[PDB]
Amino acid sequence: EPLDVVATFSIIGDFAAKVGGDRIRLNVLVGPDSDTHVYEPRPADAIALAGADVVLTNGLEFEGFLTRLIAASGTDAAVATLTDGVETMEEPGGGHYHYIDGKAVFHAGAHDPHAWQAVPNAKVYVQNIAAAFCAADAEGCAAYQANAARYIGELDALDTEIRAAIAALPQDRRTVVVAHNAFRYFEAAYGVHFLSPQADVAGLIREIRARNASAIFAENISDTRLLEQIAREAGLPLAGTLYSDALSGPDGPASNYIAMMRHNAGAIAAALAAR
Ligand code: NA
Protein backbone atom coordinates (compact mmCIF):
# COMPACT_ATOMS: atom_id res chain seq x y z
CA GLU A 1 0.00 0.00 0.00
CA PRO A 2 2.40 0.51 1.88
CA LEU A 3 0.69 -1.01 4.91
CA ASP A 4 1.33 1.48 7.82
CA VAL A 5 2.32 -0.57 10.84
CA VAL A 6 3.02 0.63 14.37
CA ALA A 7 4.74 -1.61 16.84
CA THR A 8 4.85 -0.67 20.52
CA PHE A 9 8.48 -1.68 21.14
CA SER A 10 11.72 -2.90 19.48
CA ILE A 11 11.35 -6.67 19.81
CA ILE A 12 7.89 -6.64 18.12
CA GLY A 13 9.28 -4.20 15.67
CA ASP A 14 11.90 -6.75 14.58
CA PHE A 15 9.13 -9.34 14.07
CA ALA A 16 7.08 -6.90 12.10
CA ALA A 17 9.97 -6.08 9.83
CA LYS A 18 10.64 -9.74 9.23
CA VAL A 19 7.05 -10.44 8.31
CA GLY A 20 6.26 -7.30 6.42
CA GLY A 21 9.47 -6.84 4.37
CA ASP A 22 9.25 -4.07 1.83
CA ARG A 23 5.47 -4.01 1.88
CA ILE A 24 5.17 -2.09 5.14
CA ARG A 25 6.13 1.23 6.56
CA LEU A 26 7.02 0.57 10.20
CA ASN A 27 7.10 2.93 13.15
CA VAL A 28 8.23 1.67 16.53
CA LEU A 29 7.03 3.62 19.54
CA VAL A 30 9.72 2.59 22.10
CA GLY A 31 13.10 1.94 20.59
CA PRO A 32 16.27 0.26 21.88
CA ASP A 33 17.76 1.16 25.23
CA SER A 34 14.96 3.42 26.49
CA ASP A 35 14.37 4.00 30.15
CA THR A 36 10.98 2.41 29.90
CA HIS A 37 9.87 -1.15 30.85
CA VAL A 38 8.61 -2.80 27.61
CA TYR A 39 6.24 0.02 26.50
CA GLU A 40 4.95 3.12 28.14
CA PRO A 41 2.55 5.62 26.75
CA ARG A 42 3.73 8.94 25.38
CA PRO A 43 1.57 11.59 23.77
CA ALA A 44 3.78 11.68 20.59
CA ASP A 45 2.65 8.08 20.01
CA ALA A 46 -0.45 9.78 18.55
CA ILE A 47 1.46 11.01 15.47
CA ALA A 48 2.33 7.38 14.52
CA LEU A 49 -1.02 5.89 15.50
CA ALA A 50 -3.01 8.43 13.58
CA GLY A 51 -1.70 7.24 10.17
CA ALA A 52 -1.83 3.51 11.08
CA ASP A 53 -3.36 0.50 9.42
CA VAL A 54 -2.24 -2.04 12.02
CA VAL A 55 -0.94 -1.57 15.55
CA LEU A 56 0.97 -4.47 17.13
CA THR A 57 1.00 -4.74 20.90
CA ASN A 58 2.21 -7.15 23.43
CA GLY A 59 -0.77 -7.52 25.63
CA LEU A 60 -3.72 -5.76 27.18
CA GLU A 61 -1.88 -3.38 29.67
CA PHE A 62 -2.03 -0.05 27.73
CA GLU A 63 -4.43 -1.07 25.00
CA GLY A 64 -6.71 1.51 26.59
CA PHE A 65 -4.37 4.35 25.78
CA LEU A 66 -3.70 3.05 22.26
CA THR A 67 -7.29 2.49 21.35
CA ARG A 68 -8.34 5.86 22.80
CA LEU A 69 -5.80 7.58 20.63
CA ILE A 70 -6.88 5.56 17.57
CA ALA A 71 -10.62 6.57 18.19
CA ALA A 72 -9.59 10.20 18.58
CA SER A 73 -7.78 10.12 15.25
CA GLY A 74 -10.81 8.75 13.40
CA THR A 75 -8.44 6.12 11.97
CA ASP A 76 -9.91 2.69 12.14
CA ALA A 77 -6.69 0.60 12.66
CA ALA A 78 -6.72 -3.00 13.60
CA VAL A 79 -5.00 -3.55 17.00
CA ALA A 80 -3.35 -6.93 17.21
CA THR A 81 -2.57 -8.31 20.65
CA LEU A 82 0.30 -10.61 19.91
CA THR A 83 0.05 -12.69 23.07
CA ASP A 84 -3.35 -14.03 21.82
CA GLY A 85 -2.80 -17.74 21.78
CA VAL A 86 0.31 -17.60 23.96
CA GLU A 87 0.04 -19.41 27.31
CA THR A 88 0.87 -16.43 29.45
CA MET A 89 2.02 -16.85 33.12
CA GLU A 90 0.82 -14.77 36.11
CA GLU A 91 3.20 -12.54 38.05
CA PRO A 92 4.52 -14.29 41.18
CA GLY A 93 1.75 -14.17 43.83
CA GLY A 94 -0.75 -12.59 41.39
CA GLY A 95 -3.89 -14.75 41.99
CA HIS A 96 -6.65 -14.50 44.69
CA TYR A 97 -10.32 -15.72 44.80
CA HIS A 98 -13.56 -13.68 44.94
CA TYR A 99 -16.87 -15.18 46.15
CA ILE A 100 -19.20 -13.99 43.30
CA ASP A 101 -22.47 -16.02 43.51
CA GLY A 102 -21.53 -18.73 45.99
CA LYS A 103 -18.38 -19.87 44.04
CA ALA A 104 -14.83 -18.85 44.91
CA VAL A 105 -13.80 -17.44 41.51
CA PHE A 106 -10.08 -17.14 40.79
CA HIS A 107 -8.90 -13.73 39.50
CA ALA A 108 -5.73 -13.82 37.44
CA GLY A 109 -4.35 -10.35 38.13
CA ALA A 110 -1.36 -9.14 36.06
CA HIS A 111 0.43 -11.47 33.64
CA ASP A 112 4.15 -11.55 33.14
CA PRO A 113 4.65 -9.67 29.87
CA HIS A 114 8.09 -11.21 28.88
CA ALA A 115 6.70 -14.04 26.77
CA TRP A 116 9.24 -13.66 23.93
CA GLN A 117 11.99 -15.18 26.11
CA ALA A 118 10.63 -18.61 25.11
CA VAL A 119 11.26 -19.02 21.39
CA PRO A 120 8.09 -21.11 20.77
CA ASN A 121 6.21 -18.04 21.96
CA ALA A 122 8.00 -15.80 19.49
CA LYS A 123 6.60 -18.16 16.71
CA VAL A 124 3.11 -17.34 17.82
CA TYR A 125 3.87 -13.65 17.84
CA VAL A 126 5.12 -13.92 14.28
CA GLN A 127 2.10 -16.03 13.22
CA ASN A 128 -0.20 -13.35 14.75
CA ILE A 129 1.55 -10.62 13.01
CA ALA A 130 1.24 -12.35 9.54
CA ALA A 131 -2.41 -12.86 10.32
CA ALA A 132 -3.00 -9.30 11.12
CA PHE A 133 -1.16 -8.05 8.05
CA CYS A 134 -2.66 -10.79 5.77
CA ALA A 135 -5.95 -9.42 7.07
CA ALA A 136 -5.51 -5.76 6.61
CA ASP A 137 -3.87 -6.23 3.16
CA ALA A 138 -5.34 -9.21 1.39
CA GLU A 139 -3.10 -8.75 -1.63
CA GLY A 140 0.08 -8.99 0.47
CA CYS A 141 -0.99 -12.16 2.22
CA ALA A 142 1.16 -14.61 0.30
CA ALA A 143 4.23 -12.49 0.83
CA TYR A 144 3.62 -11.95 4.58
CA GLN A 145 2.94 -15.57 4.94
CA ALA A 146 6.00 -16.70 3.10
CA ASN A 147 8.11 -14.19 5.13
CA ALA A 148 6.59 -15.61 8.31
CA ALA A 149 7.18 -19.21 7.38
CA ARG A 150 10.83 -18.61 6.61
CA TYR A 151 11.48 -16.60 9.87
CA ILE A 152 9.61 -19.21 11.82
CA GLY A 153 12.00 -21.86 10.35
CA GLU A 154 14.92 -19.81 11.65
CA LEU A 155 13.26 -19.49 15.08
CA ASP A 156 12.87 -23.23 15.12
CA ALA A 157 16.62 -23.70 14.50
CA LEU A 158 17.28 -21.11 17.29
CA ASP A 159 15.05 -22.94 19.74
CA THR A 160 16.89 -26.22 19.00
CA GLU A 161 20.28 -24.49 19.39
CA ILE A 162 19.28 -23.10 22.78
CA ARG A 163 18.07 -26.52 23.93
CA ALA A 164 21.28 -28.23 22.71
CA ALA A 165 23.43 -25.70 24.62
CA ILE A 166 21.54 -26.10 27.93
CA ALA A 167 21.38 -29.92 27.62
CA ALA A 168 25.19 -29.97 27.53
CA LEU A 169 25.42 -28.39 30.96
CA PRO A 170 25.85 -30.43 34.11
CA GLN A 171 22.52 -31.05 35.85
CA ASP A 172 23.60 -29.46 39.13
CA ARG A 173 24.65 -26.17 37.48
CA ARG A 174 21.49 -24.59 36.16
CA THR A 175 20.90 -21.51 38.29
CA VAL A 176 21.71 -17.89 37.80
CA VAL A 177 20.77 -14.74 39.53
CA VAL A 178 19.31 -11.43 38.27
CA ALA A 179 18.17 -8.26 40.05
CA HIS A 180 14.99 -8.17 38.01
CA ASN A 181 13.60 -11.42 36.67
CA ALA A 182 12.44 -10.81 33.04
CA PHE A 183 13.30 -14.41 32.26
CA ARG A 184 10.52 -16.59 33.67
CA TYR A 185 9.41 -17.74 30.26
CA PHE A 186 13.06 -18.71 29.48
CA GLU A 187 13.08 -20.73 32.73
CA ALA A 188 9.70 -22.35 31.77
CA ALA A 189 10.91 -23.34 28.32
CA TYR A 190 14.54 -24.29 28.92
CA GLY A 191 16.38 -26.15 31.60
CA VAL A 192 17.60 -23.14 33.71
CA HIS A 193 16.54 -21.30 36.94
CA PHE A 194 16.61 -17.64 37.72
CA LEU A 195 16.71 -16.31 41.31
CA SER A 196 15.96 -12.64 41.95
CA PRO A 197 14.70 -10.46 44.89
CA GLN A 198 10.86 -11.15 45.23
CA ALA A 199 16.55 -6.95 54.71
CA ASP A 200 15.14 -9.61 52.29
CA VAL A 201 18.43 -10.13 50.39
CA ALA A 202 19.03 -12.64 53.18
CA GLY A 203 16.21 -14.86 51.84
CA LEU A 204 17.66 -14.69 48.31
CA ILE A 205 21.16 -15.32 49.66
CA ARG A 206 20.04 -18.48 51.33
CA GLU A 207 18.39 -19.91 48.20
CA ILE A 208 21.57 -18.90 46.27
CA ARG A 209 23.75 -20.93 48.63
CA ALA A 210 21.22 -23.73 48.61
CA ARG A 211 21.16 -23.93 44.78
CA ASN A 212 24.89 -23.24 44.19
CA ALA A 213 24.02 -20.44 41.83
CA SER A 214 27.04 -19.73 39.54
CA ALA A 215 26.71 -16.16 38.52
CA ILE A 216 24.85 -12.98 38.45
CA PHE A 217 23.75 -11.12 35.37
CA ALA A 218 22.86 -7.49 34.94
CA GLU A 219 19.83 -6.26 32.91
CA ASN A 220 18.35 -2.74 32.09
CA ILE A 221 15.23 -2.91 34.21
CA SER A 222 16.59 -3.12 37.78
CA ASP A 223 18.50 -0.08 38.94
CA THR A 224 22.24 -1.17 39.39
CA ARG A 225 22.50 -0.69 43.10
CA LEU A 226 20.45 -3.82 43.96
CA LEU A 227 22.65 -5.93 41.66
CA GLU A 228 25.87 -4.72 43.34
CA GLN A 229 24.41 -5.39 46.81
CA ILE A 230 23.51 -8.95 45.91
CA ALA A 231 26.84 -9.88 44.30
CA ARG A 232 28.71 -8.37 47.18
CA GLU A 233 26.66 -10.19 49.81
CA ALA A 234 26.52 -13.43 47.81
CA GLY A 235 30.15 -13.40 46.62
CA LEU A 236 29.11 -14.24 43.05
CA PRO A 237 30.98 -12.98 40.00
CA LEU A 238 29.11 -10.66 37.54
CA ALA A 239 29.06 -12.65 34.32
CA GLY A 240 27.52 -10.11 31.95
CA THR A 241 24.32 -8.52 30.81
CA LEU A 242 21.09 -10.19 29.65
CA TYR A 243 18.72 -8.41 27.27
CA SER A 244 15.20 -8.46 28.73
CA ASP A 245 12.74 -6.04 27.12
CA ALA A 246 14.52 -4.29 24.32
CA LEU A 247 16.90 -5.00 21.52
CA SER A 248 20.30 -3.22 21.53
CA GLY A 249 21.26 -0.62 19.05
CA PRO A 250 22.37 -1.83 15.60
CA ASP A 251 26.05 -2.01 16.66
CA GLY A 252 25.27 -3.79 19.93
CA PRO A 253 25.13 -7.56 20.55
CA ALA A 254 21.30 -7.83 20.34
CA SER A 255 20.34 -5.90 17.32
CA ASN A 256 17.54 -8.31 16.34
CA TYR A 257 15.62 -10.94 18.29
CA ILE A 258 17.64 -13.96 17.10
CA ALA A 259 20.90 -12.30 18.03
CA MET A 260 19.41 -11.25 21.37
CA MET A 261 18.43 -14.80 22.22
CA ARG A 262 21.79 -16.25 20.96
CA HIS A 263 23.51 -13.80 23.27
CA ASN A 264 21.36 -14.49 26.31
CA ALA A 265 21.44 -18.22 25.90
CA GLY A 266 25.14 -18.30 25.06
CA ALA A 267 26.17 -16.08 27.98
CA ILE A 268 24.05 -18.10 30.41
CA ALA A 269 25.54 -21.40 29.19
CA ALA A 270 29.06 -19.99 29.32
CA ALA A 271 28.63 -18.92 32.95
CA LEU A 272 27.13 -22.24 33.94
CA ALA A 273 29.66 -24.31 32.08
CA ALA A 274 32.54 -22.65 34.01
CA ARG A 275 31.72 -20.39 37.07
NA1 NA B 1 13.59 -1.40 29.13
UniProtKB/Swiss-Prot annotation:
Say which domain of life the source belongs to. Answer: Bacteria
Q: List the disulfide bonds.
A: 134-141
Consequence of changing residue 97 to A: No defect in zinc binding from solution. No defect in zinc acquisition from chaperone AztD
**Consequences of knocking out this gene:** No effect on growth and no effect on zinc cellular level in zinc repleted media. In zinc limited media, growth is reduced in a znuA mutant background and also in an znuA and aztD mutant background. In zinc depleted media, zinc cellular levels are reduced in a znuA mutant background, an aztD mutant background and a znuA and aztD mutant background.
GO annotation, biological process: cell adhesion; zinc ion transport
Q: Is Transport there in the keyword field?
A: yes
Keywords, alphabetical: Disulfide bond, Ion transport, Metal-binding, Periplasm, Signal, Transport, Zinc, Zinc transport
The main place the protein resides is periplasm
Q: What are the subcellular locations of this protein?
A: Periplasm
Q: What induces it?
A: Up-regulated upon zinc starvation.
Q: Where is this region: D-loop?
A: 93-108
The entry marks the following residues as binding Zn(2+), namely: 37, 114, 180, 245
Give the UniProt entry's GO cellular component terms.
periplasmic space
* Alphabetized GO MF terms: zinc ion binding
InterPro entries in UniProt: AdhesinB (IPR006129), AztC-like (IPR047701), Bact_metal-bind_prot9 (IPR050492), Lipoprotein_PsaA-like (IPR006128), ZnuA-like (IPR006127)
According to the record's subunit comment, the protein's assembly and interactions are:
Monomer.
Please provide the record's free-text comment about the domains of this protein: The D-loop is required for the efficient acquisition of Zn(2+) from chaperone AztD.
State the family it belongs to.
Answer: Belongs to the bacterial solute-binding protein 9 family.
Name the job this protein performs. Part of the ATP-binding cassette (ABC) transport system AztABCD involved in zinc import. Binds zinc with high affinity and specificity and delivers it to the membrane permease for translocation into the cytoplasm.
Query: What is the protein's name according to its record?
Result: High-affinity zinc uptake system protein AztC
Native organism taxonomy: Bacteria, Pseudomonadati, Pseudomonadota, Alphaproteobacteria, Rhodobacterales
